[PDB]
Design a protein around this nucleic acid. Structure first.
Ligand SMILES: [Zn+2]
Lengths: 71, 183, 74, 185, 117, 86, 121
RNA sequence: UUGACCUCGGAUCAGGUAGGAGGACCCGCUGAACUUAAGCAUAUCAAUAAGCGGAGGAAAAGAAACCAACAGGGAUUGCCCUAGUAACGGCGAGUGAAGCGGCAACAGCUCAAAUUUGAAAGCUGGCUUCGGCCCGCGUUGUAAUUUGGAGAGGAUGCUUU
């Protein structure tokens, strides 16, 4: 708190952190999945459009109609 | 080869050979310093099964600890006190392990295998360089050696219900009032 | 006087006979600090001074703790 | 009067303690060591069968490498190393075993005379682990063993074996069982 | 039951939807890393221990070595192609063996394995 | 001999006096080592490596051959050539 | 009085030393005579101080560059010529040391790597 | 006389490392009293506060000397219910878990006990023309192989870099 009060009255700049995440949220590359991945679609909808299974476990909630990814 | 025989001999500590050798060594250690560097392990089978290697970066340190109570008993083990005293003398080393070597009427003697984390022979070996990570700074002070693991009750089962994941973390988990959003 | 100037904290709290500071404990390596006084801990906390070096660390972290010069520098 | 240093006094008092206590027979057997002549004969044979140093090994390997650039029998050497020699004794491969008498953790070698007696390998206790060390190009050697030799001196090895089993084993046979030391008198 | 200082140990959960968003983004990151692969591993069907739950079944930890050998899947290849292996479990009966073997051949029937290079 | 050494001996001896037995220092009876073991203790097979030339030395020699072919190391010269050269 | 930086970058050591000497002498004389009737002398004094700072910076940079050219293949560098980082960053395991594996692990990873696959719906 | 070994020391010798801070969360050690029981001492407060030691971005725990009595489960951690149940208690005040079940996340491994013995095959330093040369550590054991729901050695024929 005293440190934050000090920086408020200090002429030293506020060091803004960029939002660099450790893990990327979208697949990338020149492979098949990367050129057909919709960044505005979820994992289940993307794997539905691919024709693949996303989760091999037991269903844990209700799904949207035409899920086809949560086996 | 010979280490099997030494293990069987170490299992008979009141036999004539082992009793004679223990008494002569106790006399010498009593007249040495409290915490003194040991050139080689007096029990090579025991040190070898605890992870000691005849390699640059490995050090033995013999230490005597006054035995008896602290009728308030010290909940800290005498072996834990030994590792802590040696760890302060060798503040640049990491305590790997320790083992009983001798006992007298007023002292109990232990040997502590230490490892240098800055030696290149240790930093290049994938079997020991886990100790080079800074999360292993002073393992003897946080109950992370063998005596620390025993005294904290870190065992599986119904007998170790309140201590198997940490006693104070379990107590904080049981004494926390969880209020959700939809009540 | 009872208390003289201390070298570490700069206060007139160093006992003239015991030669021990009542505010920081100057001959001891560790600075005197107690958890029953939060006000005392916040009067000498990290951030109440000049920060000659600790204020330069976040900018060096932001660029990855890099060395060298930009390309084309003179 | 004058004051002696501490470690020298510890050394001399460890002498007197190890020689004037009632020593158990397994430790008291190590005070009976080979004579000068038999140790000289044994070391003549073991000096005939020394291993190669690092320089000779790299030199020989360079010779084979350039011979390949431009046939052998099994090498016969003195066998050393405590666990290796114990494994050789247990499998009845060793022919003669020489055990040093000044191994500081003496537990590493107390069972060795009894083991050699049980499996039937002739053994002898020699003066100096540093002597066995010079033979194998190391600083020290707790025990050395010879298993088999080249043809041209097999007879000599046999005589040496017989020598120790007539010159050391029967002189030790009665005193290998008795406690040593004491201040009676 | 407020005998102790419960004020210092009240845990609220105003970060429940934020943690749900964090969990979904972690699953998305797992999807990004394992792009054609499922984010989950295949797990066997096991029976619930006690007599109260003996009637129902659930997902286990990993397939038995006998189940993998009977399905025709080698032990060392199995963790690298999305199957979980448990060396502690035993079959003990011919009915769990057949069920999990059927599960493994059903998984094999619907798998697109790519060559190494 | 001297009194101090004998005092030390008596101290460490009193540390090793079992007075509850009639004979604290009996003669050793070889109840186990008197019988001889005629066969080895291990019935394990001998590895083929103990009958064939060394494979580690073969790898080392091939590494040396690769080093000579790259000119990285100098080849073999017999010691009399090194003596007459120097 | 005022000197640009690139002109200082072009010159060599003895030259930069003689501008350093003449600037210091001019600053000393102007500080002596500036105690009376300080008019435009103040701006010149400030500019001269900045000029000495620039010259000292250029000589220090050239000297450290030459010292780094000396220690290009030597194993140990002076502590002034080593990267600072942090104390913990200087003590952590190196990239070559941390990425090392055992031979058994390398064999297992060589012959049984993680495979690419897809379960079809 | 000379040279090894072992042990104990010195050096403003070379290369390193520790101390302090911070301490919300974490791992240990140590450890009260008020208060409640309309008095109070067992109990409670509380294995809390204060005090001391030690880390990190998380820590700790962790791949069963486990749970179970099953048609069985299968490292650790955390959420939900279990459950104010079992159990213990001036059986008063009260104290108070765990297995199963649903979920989140999932990942497995390294040594010691073996003889490489047809070849210490291993490693720290110094010198470098940077390619390979010396001293040392080490046989009282450094590499490879193996870690008990395993494994080794031979034989065998496919399949892998
Ligand atoms: Zn002060």
């Amino acid at each position: 708190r005293e440190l934050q009060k000090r920086k408020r009255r200090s002429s030293r700049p506020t060091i803004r952190m960029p939002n660099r995440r450790k893990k990327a949220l979208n697949p990338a590359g020149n492979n098949i999945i990367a050129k057909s991945w919709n960044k505005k679609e979820t994992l289940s909808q993307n794997y539905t459009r691919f024709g693949l299974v996303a989760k091999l476990g037991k269903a844990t909630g209700g799904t949207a109609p035409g899920n086809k990814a949560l086996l | 080869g010979a280490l099997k025989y030494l293990e069987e001999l170490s299992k008979k500590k009141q036999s004539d050979v082992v009793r004679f050798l223990l008494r002569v060594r106790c006399w010498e250690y009593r007249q040495l310093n409290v915490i003194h560097r040991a050139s080689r392990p007096s029990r090579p089978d025991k040190a070898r099964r605890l992870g000691y290697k005849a390699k640059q970066g490995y050090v033995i340190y013999r230490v005597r600890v006054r035995r008896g109570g602290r009728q308030l008993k010290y909940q800290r083990s005498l072996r834990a006190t030994a590792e802590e005293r040696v760890g302060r003398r060798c503040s640049n080393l990491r305590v790997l392990n320790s083992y009983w070597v001798n006992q007298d009427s007023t002292y109990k003697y232990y040997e502590v295998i230490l490892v240098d984390p800055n030696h290149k022979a240790i930093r290049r070996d994938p079997r020991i360089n886990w100790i080079c990570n800074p999360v292993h700074k002073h393992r003897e002070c946080r109950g992370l050696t063998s005596t620390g693991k025993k005294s904290r009750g870190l065992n599986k089962g119904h007998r170790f219900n309140k201590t198997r994941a940490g006693r104070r973390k379990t107590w904080k988990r049981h004494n926390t009032l969880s209020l959700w959003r939809y009540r | 006087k009872t208390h003289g100037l201390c070298r570490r904290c700069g206060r007139r709290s160093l006992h003239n006979q015991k030669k021990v500071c009542a505010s920081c404990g100057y001959p001891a390596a560790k600075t005197r600090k107690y958890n029953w006084s939060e006000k005392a801990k916040r009067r000498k906390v990290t951030g109440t001074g000049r920060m000659r070096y600790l204020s330069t660390v976040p900018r060096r972290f932001k660029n990855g703790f890099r060395t060298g010069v930009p390309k084309g520098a003179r | 009067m004058v004051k002696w240093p501490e470690y020298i006094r510890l050394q001399r008092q460890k002498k007197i303690l190890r020689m004037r206590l009632k020593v158990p027979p397994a430790i008291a057997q190590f005070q009976y060591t080979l004579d000068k002549n038999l140790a000289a004969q044994a070391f003549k044979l073991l000096n005939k069968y020394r291993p190669e140093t690092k320089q000779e090994k790299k030199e020989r390997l360079l010779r084979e490498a350039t011979a390949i650039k431009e046939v052998s029998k099994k090498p016969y050497t003195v066998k050393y190393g405590l666990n290796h020699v114990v494994g050789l004794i247990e499998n009845k491969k060793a022919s003669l075993v020489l055990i040093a008498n000044d191994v500081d953790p003496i537990e590493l070698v107390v069972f060795l005379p009894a083991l050699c007696r049980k499996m039937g390998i002739p053994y002898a206790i020699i003066k100096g682990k540093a002597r066995l060390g010079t033979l194998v190009h190391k600083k020290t050697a707790a025990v050395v063993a010879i298993t088999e030799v080249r043809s041209e001196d097999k007879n000599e090895l046999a005589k040496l074996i017989s020598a120790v089993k007539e010159g050391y084993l029967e002189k030790v046979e009665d005193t290998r069982k008795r406690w040593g030391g004491g201040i009676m008198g | 039951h407020f005998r102790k200082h419960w004020q210092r140990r009240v845990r609220c959960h105003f970060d429940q939807p934020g943690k749900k968003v964090t969990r979904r983004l972690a699953r998305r990151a797992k999807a990004a890393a394992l792009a054609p692969r499922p984010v989950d591993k295949l797990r066997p069907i096991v029976r619930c221990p006690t007599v109260k739950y003996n009637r129902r079944t659930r997902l286990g930890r990993g397939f038995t070595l006998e189940e993998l050998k009977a399905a025709g899947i080698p032990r060392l290849l199995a963790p690298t192609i999305g199957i979980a292996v448990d060396h502690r479990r035993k079959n003990l009966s011919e009915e769990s063996l057949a069920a999990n073997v059927q599960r493994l051949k059903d998984y094999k029937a619907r798998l697109i394995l790519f060559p190494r290079k | 001999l001297s009194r101090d050494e004998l005092e030390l001996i008596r101290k460490v001896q009193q540390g090793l006096i079992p007075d509850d037995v009639e004979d604290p220092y009996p003669d050793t009876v070889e109840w186990f080592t008197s019988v001889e073991e005629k066969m080895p203790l291990s019935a394990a097979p001998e590895p083929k490596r103990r009958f064939i030339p060394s494979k580690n030395e073969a790898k080392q020699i091939m590494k040396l051959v690769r080093a000579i072919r790259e000119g990285r190391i100098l080849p073999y010269k017999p010691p009399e050539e090194r003596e007459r050269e120097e | 009085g005022k000197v640009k930086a690139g002109q200082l970058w072009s010159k060599n050591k003895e030259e930069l030393t003689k501008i350093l000497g003449e600037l210091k002498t001019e600053l000393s004389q102007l500080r002596i005579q500036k105690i009376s009737s300080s008019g435009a002398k103040l701006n010149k004094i400030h500019d001269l101080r900045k000029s000495i700072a620039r010259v000292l910076t250029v000589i220090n940079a050239k000297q450290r560059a030459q010292l780094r050219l000396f220690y290009k293949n030597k194993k140990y560098l002076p502590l002034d010529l080593r990267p600072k980082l942090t104390r913990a960053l200087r003590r952590r395991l190196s990239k070559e040391d941390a990425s090392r594996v055992l031979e058994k692990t390398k064999k297992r990873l060589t012959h049984f790597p993680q495979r690419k696959y897809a379960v079809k719906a």
